[PDB]
Design a protein around this ligand. Sequence first.
Ligand SMILES: Nc1nc2c(ncn2[C@@H]2O[C@H](COP(=O)(O)OP(=O)(O)NP(=O)(O)O)[C@@H](O)[C@H]2O)c(=O)[nH]1
Ligand SMILES: [Mg+2]
Length: 173
Amino acid sequence: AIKCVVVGDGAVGKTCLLISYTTNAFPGYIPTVFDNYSANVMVDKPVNLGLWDTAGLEDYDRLRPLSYPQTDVFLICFSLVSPASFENVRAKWYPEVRHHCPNTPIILVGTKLDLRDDKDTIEKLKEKKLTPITYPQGLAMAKEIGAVKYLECSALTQRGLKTVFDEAIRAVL
Ligand SMILES: Nc1nc2c(ncn2[C@@H]2O[C@H](COP(=O)(O)OP(=O)(O)NP(=O)(O)O)[C@@H](O)[C@H]2O)c(=O)[nH]1
Ligand SMILES: [Mg+2]
């Protein structure tokens, strides 16, 4: 099995992405405490992928890193429509992962891709003087954190969803 650990701010869509990917179902917001999912996947070919779905809420900061030993690949996730979560990629998640796992490959994943170029979402953000994260900004952030790939997905439409796991696996094999 490959151990893939998924981290990122509360509500960015970690659980939706894992459940959408393993089951084709879309939940179902219940904040995660901790869950383990597993998929037998064909990449490039069969793989047992163990997915560790972590708590994004700050109450679990002291506990979350207990999950980290032995990880094969990390997914650091941020919502493409939440600039705070994007800044936390380098302000919180990158350092927390690296504190514990200096070497383990990171994939940076921008989530809720279906909302990024949604007009109502862009309007609401604009009122707040903010704008969705664009692909080149995500790429710059991937570079700044030495992520091995930057990928965008939607758990809702499944755009980009398979490639996230193909690349997590390619990162390890
Ligand atoms: N529009 C859209 N909404 C999404 C998508 N993925 C998740 N959401 C919404 O964002 C909310 C948070 O989703 P969830 O996966 O539970 O977030 P989480 O990162 O696992 N939060 P926690 O760290 O607290 O477990 C849910 O209401 C969910 O339906 C998406 O791909 N598109
Ligand atoms: Mg969750």
